[PDB]
Design a binder for this molecule. Sequence first.
Ligand SMILES: [Mg+2]
Length: 479
Amino acid sequence: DKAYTDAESYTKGLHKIYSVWALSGTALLRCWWTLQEQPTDEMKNAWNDAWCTEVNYMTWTTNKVEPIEGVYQRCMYIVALVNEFLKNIPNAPESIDKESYIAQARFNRAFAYYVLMDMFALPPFITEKNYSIEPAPLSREDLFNWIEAELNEIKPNLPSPRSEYGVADQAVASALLARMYLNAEIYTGKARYTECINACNEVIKAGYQLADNYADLFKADNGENPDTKKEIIYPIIFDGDSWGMAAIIIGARGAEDKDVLLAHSGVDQGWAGFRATSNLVHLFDFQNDEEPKASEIQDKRGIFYDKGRSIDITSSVSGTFETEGWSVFKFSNLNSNGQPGKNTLWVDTDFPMFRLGDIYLMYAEAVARGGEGSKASAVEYINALRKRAYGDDKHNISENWLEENNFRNLLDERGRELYWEGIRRTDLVRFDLLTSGSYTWDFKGGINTGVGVNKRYNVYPIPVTDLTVNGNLQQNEGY
Ligand SMILES: [Mg+2]
């Protein structure tokens, strides 16, 4: 698209690569987030589009589904850009730090392949070294192995942790490895819980801290507030001075008066799409658990708007945004001082792709499942999260809690801590509860009370779009 020539062009080329996550151009962050939340127990979408039902229910086929196309095209676009960048970078002028730029381009490509591996399993494998009109996929395990070797090799050449908010630093590479290793039994058939713990410790030792205020993690000024910057390892950056994060926020608001929307959210518009299931609400403690009300919640992590809404989605998932399912206002374009962000549409709120709260929970789960690490520390990390949640010391857990009921307390706690941060689908797959009939939620499988679905649905199908033009590429099993 833009040829490489002077120093500026190489710096702008790297920035274009990083920018694909935030870019509309639909948007990678939105598509990815949708695909990680909408088929789960965390979110159901009230839009009437045929794709929404399919994704809501997990009844999709190989018929084209717009967010599936989005995630796939945009990830492979990142890979394309990085490959062209790496091909040009040896000709860079002397003023460019080639070693740093190569390490960072490679991080972006590794992350794009991570998302593809987790979501599609078997993408085409195309690097700057194996150019082909019709590239073949690796096995999922081989792709994992390649991504891991990319991240291990580049890590000592990446910037030091926190040296620039938004840049893929050494700790960002370790956070991605932690997330890969936690899930390695899914991707590779072999568990890597010790390696998960090792990557978590690399992050923990870099001096990150939990934000004092949980809610501010997801407000307009999360990227500028020092309290929340202590915790955010890797953000997808947004600023009012692209519709990706705007769509996630606005999508979760209803058709209310502009002023009431601005009052409570810092936005003009509410598209009446994304909202909660009963399962998400019931994960949190309330003053009266038999009759939950958003204003009586005890675990303050749950940030809900309940006016006029039932807890359950019962009659229909579409057309019922205003009446069935609580709204989720976790991501907000009000700043931490209550003021609106500087634009009513183009939000300031950053997406926290990796943050220390997740690292804590990963460390605890990896130790629970038998990795080499400390149960005492695991308990300390979960209790830090729960003290923040409840504002007191009366909701601590103990070591037995980590292992009991087949690690389900950890799945529940990742729900309470990390809901709507784009990780729920991966976590459900790890517990093999995404597709199973043993754990159901509102409209799972297309039945209101919920049913299991076939195990093919643990991954999305590769676009027929790409299968038509690439003869070496194969569809995922079962589709
Ligand atoms: Mg921002």
